[PDB]
């Protein structure tokens, strides 16, 4: 599994969350999103294989996943309280972070 697989894992589990009926299902999918975000954060995106590991672009990339993981944790907290609809709405906003921070490097 590489960075592209991790990106598609995020997409598949966002669909799981969208279609979920209860908080347990949302928690499972958020778990897989968090795992894939951690794996992707350690990868070097194609457009940045050029750059040095501490370039402003690579810091952008890794920090986009720090923000994403923190937002996944916020959604997990909602799901852990039984707030299914709140957690699903939070998951929708994970696409805003994913698209704005990370997409420009794939």
Author numbering: 1 to 106
What does the paper say about this structure?
Eventually, four pairs of BRIL mutants and three pairs of Flavodoxin mutants, together with their WT proteins, were crystallized and structure determined. Compared to WT BRIL, three mutants (T9C-A36C, V16C-A29C, and K27C-A79C) show relatively better or similar diffraction resolution, lower conformational entropy (ΔS) and comparable B-factor. For BRIL proteins, the simulation B-factors are consistent with the experimental values. Based on our algorithm, the best-engineered constructs of BRIL and Flavodoxin show lower entropy and higher diffraction quality than the wild type proteins, and the predicted disulfide bond on GLP-1R facilitated crystallization of the GLP-1R transmembrane domain.
